[PDB]
Amino acid sequence: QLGELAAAFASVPVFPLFDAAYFIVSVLYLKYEPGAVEMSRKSPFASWLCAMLHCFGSYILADLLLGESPIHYFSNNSSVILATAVWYLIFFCPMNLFYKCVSFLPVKLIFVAMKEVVRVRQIAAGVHHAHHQYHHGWFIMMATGWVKGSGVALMSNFEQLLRGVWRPETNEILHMSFPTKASLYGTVLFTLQQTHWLPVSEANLVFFFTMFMIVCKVFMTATH
Amino acid sequence: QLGELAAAFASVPVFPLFDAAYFIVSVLYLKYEPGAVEMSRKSPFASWLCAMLHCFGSYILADLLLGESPIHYFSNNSSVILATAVWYLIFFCPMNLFYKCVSFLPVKLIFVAMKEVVRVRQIAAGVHHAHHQYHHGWFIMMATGWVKGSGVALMSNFEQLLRGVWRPETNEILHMSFPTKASLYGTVLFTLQQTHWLPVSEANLVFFFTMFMIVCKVFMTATH
Amino acid sequence: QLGELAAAFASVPVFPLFDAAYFIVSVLYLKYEPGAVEMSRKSPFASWLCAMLHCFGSYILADLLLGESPIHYFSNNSSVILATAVWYLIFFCPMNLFYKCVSFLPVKLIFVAMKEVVRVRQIAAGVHHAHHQYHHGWFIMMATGWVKGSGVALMSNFEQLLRGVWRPETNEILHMSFPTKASLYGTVLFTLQQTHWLPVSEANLVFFFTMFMIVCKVFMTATH
Ligand SMILES: [Ca+2]
Ligand SMILES: [Cl-]
Ligand SMILES: [Cl-]
Ligand SMILES: [Cl-]
Ligand SMILES: [Cl-]
Ligand SMILES: [Cl-]
Ligand SMILES: [Cl-]
Ligand SMILES: [Cl-]
Ligand SMILES: [Cl-]
Ligand SMILES: [Cl-]
Ligand SMILES: [Cl-]
Ligand SMILES: [Cl-]
Ligand SMILES: [Cl-]
Ligand SMILES: [Cl-]
Ligand SMILES: [Cl-]
Ligand SMILES: [Cl-]
């Protein structure tokens, strides 16, 4: 009955709880970036735009690669408003209280685990969407799933540009961080499962690859 | 009969006179930029391309956001040729005569007023076009109208790159100039009018918001 | 019977031999770039991506200008794999043997000539494709044919960014190299032939303009 558990696991509604956790962890990372708090005070619109890149960069990059509107996902009003609320609470909550609660390590690890659930689903969805337009476009499936999982990291040079920062000597392709490298392995696995060359159900691969990401990310977050 | 006046005002043919005024003021601003005259002499093709960004950047950015060909508007041969003539006359007219005439303050203020007529129509058109593709895409309507009104300012970092200039420490989002900020207020107003939450006719909002832009821009141009 | 020869010349199958020659010459140029060998060792994925830009940048830029998926051409699995093989053999062949063979001047000049065959066909194809979407879009035809022939040169600033290099003081538009300038002349000629204002068959223009590019490029390669 393991496949029955995997089917329920791979079909959990990511909206709104799992998307919120994704938004919280991502906007938390934004606040850690140099000058982010100063930017929220002096340039609140650019600060919000930065947070939307962190929350939705996966869809912005996938749509760009597939020639679709890069802000197509912003037609999802409930998601945009929910991410906007997370940005506001993290940067402007009185007593900084929301930050204090979601930074509590037991609470933060849970949100980190829930974000990985969303990232794996995102990779698989990117592969399947590209496949729908290109039945044998293996390289297009791999590219789309990769940017769906990496998110804002693959546009980090230009996320920095928006913030008034320019560091051209490195980029996430030249030197991949773990989530970028892991999303590349993930997109190959999901593309191989799409090819029917990897003899495993789509629900089992989602389950096992998410558990891999959850263990890695929770361990990396608890260590530092 | 104020609505009868507003209907005639909001439906005046922008081509070719009002578009020409837009092109003149924009290419004048280009000539004010550092190295612009030198660039027209040594790199005349890049100089013309820069002028096309100033004249058509509104359509280039809107089409990019909506996933349409970024040079789609360049199929409008008469408009492209008219902007090309304005660029040539401003940079290469014997005796610099065309520049002298259009820089005459009474003449320049009129062209500045006529450009604002075109900008407001552009914002409204961006909102209505996004709405046609996304009936409830409020954030897509706001983004499209914003870039239609801001024009080349929102791509200023890359207009500078084309010119051989790189100033990453600032951008029009991080620090909005008045036309960028005003186009953001404008696009919210036109989106609210699209939502039917703002109880005002589309022709009246065009009239009153254009008069607001005309007074502000004429006053700002005459002061300096 | 010159038109009978020109028809056979303009319809030769570019895949796979003529495309391979294009890939070889382009990836050779990549290896000449500063830090390229070091990058292939430390960042092999970015190195491969750079080589794909050199091999396919024509299609990436044309698709971008026309609002189509920028990686649409990567659905051509055989072409992508063939370019990947060329990249691997040039950077990782034991004894560097593949490099030694294709760098042999008599062999290199032939590959240089065959690449020009592919470039001219690319320019003409860009013009005809834009024409199909815009029957009278002269400026769109010219832009599309231009980027099809110039290839990665028009994205050189961002090919450098991928490599960790940033040199904003120059770009291929501000200062055109010979292949960029020649592709601009070529796209005007093919657009004029599309307009029916240039009284010459499409096969004759391909033949004569390719011979022009072959003589120029072979002479430029043999001189230095
Ligand atoms: Ca598109
Ligand atoms: Cl940073
Ligand atoms: Cl602001
Ligand atoms: Cl998704
Ligand atoms: Cl997707
Ligand atoms: Cl098919
Ligand atoms: Cl400047
Ligand atoms: Cl030039
Ligand atoms: Cl418009
Ligand atoms: Cl529009
Ligand atoms: Cl609908
Ligand atoms: Cl370089
Ligand atoms: Cl790598
Ligand atoms: Cl082609
Ligand atoms: Cl094409
Ligand atoms: Cl038509």
Curated annotation (Swiss-Prot), chains A, B, C:
Species this chain originates from: Gallus gallus (Chicken)
Topological domain spans for side Cytoplasmic: 31-44, 97-100, 156-176
Role, per record: Intracellular monovalent cation channel required for maintenance of rapid intracellular calcium release. Acts as a potassium counter-ion channel that functions in synchronization with calcium release from intracellular stores. Opened by a change of voltage within the sarcoplasmic reticulum lumen.
A molecular function (GO) term: identical protein binding
Parent sequence residues shown: 8 to 231 of 296
Reaction catalysis annotation: K(+)(in) = K(+)(out)
Activity control mechanisms: Channel activity is activated by a change of voltage within the sarcoplasmic reticulum lumen and blocked by luminal high Ca(2+) levels.
Membrane topology per record: Multi-pass membrane protein
Complex formation: Homotrimer; conformation seems to be controled by binding to diacylglycerol (DAG).
Residue spans, topological domain Lumenal: 1-12, 67-78, 120-137, 195-202
Protein name: Trimeric intracellular cation channel type A
Subcellular location: Sarcoplasmic reticulum membrane; Nucleus membrane
Major subcellular location class: membrane
